[PDB]
Design an enzyme around this catalytic site. Structure first.
Site, short mmCIF file in Angstrom:
data_model
loop_
_atom_site.label_atom_id
_atom_site.label_comp_id
_atom_site.label_asym_id
_atom_site.label_seq_id
_atom_site.Cartn_x
_atom_site.Cartn_y
_atom_site.Cartn_z
N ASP A 1 -8.58 31.96 -24.48
CA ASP A 1 -8.55 30.55 -24.12
C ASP A 1 -9.80 30.26 -23.29
O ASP A 1 -10.64 31.14 -23.07
CB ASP A 1 -7.26 30.18 -23.37
N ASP B 1 -10.52 28.44 -19.46
CA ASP B 1 -9.89 28.00 -18.23
C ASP B 1 -10.89 27.18 -17.42
O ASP B 1 -11.99 27.68 -17.14
CB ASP B 1 -9.45 29.21 -17.40
N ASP C 1 -6.80 25.70 -20.57
CA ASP C 1 -6.07 25.49 -19.34
C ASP C 1 -6.91 24.66 -18.39
O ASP C 1 -8.10 24.95 -18.18
CB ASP C 1 -5.71 26.82 -18.68
#
Ligand SMILES: O=c1ccn([C@H]2C[C@H](O)[C@@H](COP(=O)(O)NP(=O)(O)OP(=O)(O)O)O2)c(=O)[nH]1
Ligand SMILES: [Cl-]
Ligand SMILES: [Mg+2]
Ligand SMILES: [Mg+2]
Ligand code: NA
Length: 330
Positions: free
Chosen positions: A196, A198, A254
């Site tokens: 991912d 962040d 995120d």
DNA sequence: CGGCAT
DNA sequence: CGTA
DNA sequence: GCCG
């Protein structure tokens, strides 16, 4: 033997290191321990693996383990077998077992943890198609993880990070002039790929950031960028529709908002690694009597919070030598 | 013995 | 329960 | 599983 402090936050762990084969075997046993509900055994095997990542040289003889923290009879036997035979029977039995393979498959879905995966396993489910056939069993979070599973399995690259940071910065700047976006997570530690991206968002004037994340999310959704989001909040676990040439791919993103007073603490926590931060928080409470998280560093006797301007301030207050992000890869 | 991050 |  |  080798110089080796007991806590992972007390030693540098670089991105590239030796003993990857040994550490990977111990991390299999750690993951398997978690699948059976033994979080203590998971921790020990994670810690032992991490010790090998911090050593100056390849381990070629069992004697190089003498004195190392978190090596006892079990971890040493695993290394011994790998050194003497190139494989460890226990690791191979685990790795090749239906239970391990299925639990790994299910727990790597966004929205599924060990307890959910184990319940499904005990019900006879084994494949992602089995889960799709029983959507009554699924939360909206799990439905998103399953729907985008193929893309979410594809490594996120630096080119993706740069594109995503630009669109997040555009939305943040539309939502609150002067707000900033800081890349955190594995990419800040120097990782070249990730699961991912962040991002940490703040504003230099305390209080201005209140209510920011819903405004950012609305602006991203209006640009067609949001495939999944969780919905007053400070953390967003999103799936973005990332434009690609002629197409697009889903990427986990995120977002975390912090007031500027808390920014060093949130930057420290969200830069990781996960084990590094668990070990740092353990060190803080056990060795210093202070409670650490992404919001602050609390002295429960004086009932006060430590004011920090930088990550360096936090390390220094805990009596730790400062480690830059690329040396926090425990 | 029990902790093991928050 | 899930998530970082 | 290891250790405070
Ligand atoms: O349980 C956790 C998970 C993450 N974190 C912190 C440390 C971690 O590095 C950071 C971001 O979480 P990710 O799950 O995104 N991991 P990371 O970015 O290190 O690696 P990747 O995303 O490539 O798996 O948040 C925790 O403190 N506790
Ligand atoms: Cl936290
Ligand atoms: Mg990450
Ligand atoms: Mg993340
Ligand atoms: Na998961």
């Amino acid at each position: 033997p080798a110089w080796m402090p007991a806590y992972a936050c007390q030693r540098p762990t670089p991105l590239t290191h030796h003993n990857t084969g040994l550490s990977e075997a111990l991390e299999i046993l750690a993951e398997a321990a978690g699948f059976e509900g033994s979080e203590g055994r998971l921790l020990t095997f994670c810690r032992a693996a991490s010790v090998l990542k911090a050593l100056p040289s390849p381990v070629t003889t069992l004697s190089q383990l003498q004195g190392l923290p978190h090596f006892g009879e079990h971890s040493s036997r695993v290394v011994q077998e790998l050194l003497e035979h190139g494989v460890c029977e226990e690791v191979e039995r685990v790795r090749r077992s239906e239970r391990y393979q299925t639990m790994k498959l299910f727990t790597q879905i966004f929205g599924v943890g060990v307890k959910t995966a184990d319940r499904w396993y005990r019900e006879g489910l084994r494949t992602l198609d089995d889960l799709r056939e029983q959507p009554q069993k699924l939360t909206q979070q799990q439905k998103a993880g399953l729907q985008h599973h193929q893309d979410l399995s594809t490594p996120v690259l630096r080119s993706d990070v740069d594109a995503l940071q630009q669109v997040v910065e555009e939305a943040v700047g539309q939502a609150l002039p002067g707000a900033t976006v800081t890349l955190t997570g594995g990419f800040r530690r120097g990782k070249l790929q990730g699961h991912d991206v962040d991002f940490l968002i703040t504003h230099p004037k305390e209080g201005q950031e209140a209510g920011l994340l819903p405004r950012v999310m609305c602006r991203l959704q209006d640009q067609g960028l949001i495939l999944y989001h969780q919905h007053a909040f400070e953390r967003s676990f999103c799936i973005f529709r990332l434009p690609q040439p002629g197409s697009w791919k889903a990427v986990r993103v995120d977002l975390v908002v912090a007031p500027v007073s808390q920014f060093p603490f949130a930057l420290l926590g969200w830069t990781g690694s996960k084990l590094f931060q668990r070990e740092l928080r353990r060190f803080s409470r056990k060795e210093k009597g202070l409670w650490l998280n992404s919001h602050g560093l609390f002295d429960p006797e004086q009932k006060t919070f430590f004011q920090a301007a930088s990550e360096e301030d936090i390390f220094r207050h805990l009596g730790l030598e400062y480690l830059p992000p690329e040396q926090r890869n425990a």
